[PDB]
Design a protein around this nucleic acid. Structure first.
Ligand SMILES: [Fe+3]
Length: 202
DNA sequence: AGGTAAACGT
DNA sequence: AACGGTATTACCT
C-alpha cells in the first residue's frame, strides 16, 4: 500500500549515499550552524535546524519566512551540495516527480526527545513541486496525516536512508515526528538528521 | 477578505 | 500516551 496519493516511501533509497550526505550536512552546518529556532510565540523548537540552497526556512518575530539570508550569520545559506541535489533528483524521479527543481533544503537534527508537532508545508509560492524528505541516522516515527490536522495519522518508522516524497494530492498534508528515542547509529552516533527539499521560490 | 501563527490537558 | 484544543483570535496586507 503506497503512502498516499502522490506520496511514496523509498526505503533505504539513500542508504548508499548516506555517508556522503552526512559529510555534506557537516559542511553546511560549518557555515550556517544548527540552531534551535524560536517560534513567533516565543518557544524554542526541540529540533535544531539549518538550511542550504537559495532559500532557507526560518522563524522570526512576525511569522515564518523562506529567506535567501541566514538571519544568524547575515550571510546567504550555503550552496546546496551536489550530493544533496543529485540524491533529491534521483529520489524525486523514482517517486514520479522527474521535473522537481528544489531551491531550498532544510536540515533538521533530532536529539533524544526532539519532536516536530504536526504541521503543513504550504509556505511556498509554487505548490506544484513535491517535498523530498531524507532520513539519516537513528530511527524516528513519522506521522503522515491528511489535509486537516485531525485526519487520522499513519505512523511509519523511518530508518536510516529512507526517503519520503509527497506532492500532488498529498502536498499539503500534515506531518510530524514523534519524540526521538535515544539510541546508537554508527554514522550519526546519537542523533537523527532529516533533509527536506523544496522549491520555495519561482 | 484572506492569510498568519501552533508550539497543554485529558 | 494518543489525541485534540488553541487561532472560537488579533493582527497584518
Ligand atoms: Fe514539514
Amino acid at each position: 500500500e503506497p503512502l498516499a496519493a502522490g506520496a511514496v516511501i523509498l526505503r533505504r533509497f539513500a542508504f548508499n549515499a548516506a555517508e556522503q550526505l552526512i559529510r555534506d550536512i557537516n559542511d553546511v552546518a560549518s557555515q550556517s550552524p544548527f540552531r534551535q529556532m524560536v517560534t513567533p510565540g516565543g518557544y524554542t523548537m526541540s529540533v535544531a535546524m539549518t538550511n542550504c540552497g537559495h532559500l532557507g526556512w526560518t522563524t522570526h518575530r512576525q511569522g515564518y519566512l523562506y529567506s535567501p539570508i541566514d538571519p544568524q550569520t547575515n550571510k546567504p545559506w550555503p550552496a546546496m551540495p551536489q550530493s544533496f541535489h543529485n540524491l533529491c533528483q534521483r529520489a524525486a524521479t523514482a517517486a514520479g516527480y522527474p521535473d522537481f527543481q528544489p531551491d531550498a533544503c532544510l536540515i533538521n537534527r533530532y536529539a533524544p526527545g526532539a519532536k516536530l508537532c504536526l504541521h503543513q508545508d504550504k509556505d511556498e509560492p509554487d505548490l506544484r513541486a513535491p517535498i523530498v524528505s531524507v532520513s539519516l541516522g537513528l530511527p524516528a516515527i513519522f506521522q503522515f496525516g491528511g489535509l486537516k490536522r485531525n485526519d487520522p495519522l499513519k505512523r511509519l518508522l523511518l530508518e536510516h536512508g529512507d526517503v519520503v516524497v509527497w506532492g500532488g494530492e498529498s502536498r499539503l498534508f500534515y506531518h510530524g515526528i514523534q519524540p526521538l528515542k535515544a539510541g546508537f547509529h554508527p554514522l550519526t552516533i546519537d542523533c537523527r538528521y532529516n533533509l527536506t527539499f523544496r522549491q520555495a521560490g519561482k
